[PDB]
């Protein structure tokens, strides 16, 4: 996308989202990042939405195929699960590459830095979901470290109802439960996050209240599933 204007890439990413063309969306936002300028709040959302949808479809397909593969235990099901898995890993590597070159190092504000570090944790978490061999532990620690640094910043710099802070804690909780084999840590994080946000709701406008309570409902839904 080197020959397209940054503003045109952003405009086309928004069109692709409206058309539910998420692979296109992601390629446009990848091109926008590679222009080298920092991203605005809205632009960070476009980047995240695009890749979340792309890898979300890959994860869903991988789970279908992995389930078929486990029921079977010719080479076809394993081969095709491997194909999808490699394609998923490539998308995760691409996002992690964008964060590392050079979104995170240039992100100084809490809202941008926490957002990118949450993504870094998320895409390592997706790598961990399919990891088996020599690096599954290292991948898990990479996810944990990114999430932890984002948590530390968000607790210092953001109110407990901040949607980015809440979504980070939600996803770190899922990491604890689903990846790190730490359901007690997952439950404790979700409960403390929910309770501290509840106590801060009185400070919010009607619209911010809606933003925060919507994410708190997701924390509550997980707690209901986990307890």
């Amino acid at each position: 996308m080197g020959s397209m204007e940054r503003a045109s890439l952003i405009q086309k990413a928004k069109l692709a989202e409206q058309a539910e063309r998420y692979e296109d969306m992601a390629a446009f936002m990848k091109g926008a990042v590679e222009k080298g300028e920092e991203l605005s709040c809205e632009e960070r959302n476009l980047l995240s939405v695009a890749y979340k949808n792309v890898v979300g479809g890959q994860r869903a397909a991988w789970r279908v195929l992995s389930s078929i593969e486990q029921k079977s235990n010719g080479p076809e099901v394993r081969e095709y699960r491997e194909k999808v898995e490699t394609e998923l890993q490539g998308v995760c590597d691409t996002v992690l590459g964008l964060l590392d070159s050079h979104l995170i190092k240039e992100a100084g504000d809490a809202e941008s830095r926490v957002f990118y570090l949450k993504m870094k944790g998320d895409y390592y978490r997706y790598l961990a979901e399919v990891a088996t061999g020599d690096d599954k532990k290292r991948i898990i620690d990479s996810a944990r470290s990114a999430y932890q640094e984002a948590m530390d910043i968000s607790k210092k710099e953001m109110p407990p109802t901040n949607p980015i802070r809440l979504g980070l804690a939600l996803n770190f909780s899922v990491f604890h439960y689903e990846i790190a084999n730490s359901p007690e840590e997952a439950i404790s994080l979700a409960k403390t996050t929910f309770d501290e946000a509840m106590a801060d709701l009185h400070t919010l406008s009607e619209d911010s209240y809606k933003d925060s309570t919507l994410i708190m409902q997701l924390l509550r839904d997980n707690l209901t599933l986990w307890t």
Binding site: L170, N171, D221
Partner: peptide, 8 residues
């Protein structure tokens, strides 16, 4: 267990 969605 649900993780965060991108859009409302």
């Amino acid at each position: 267990a649900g993780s965060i969605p991108g859009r409302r």
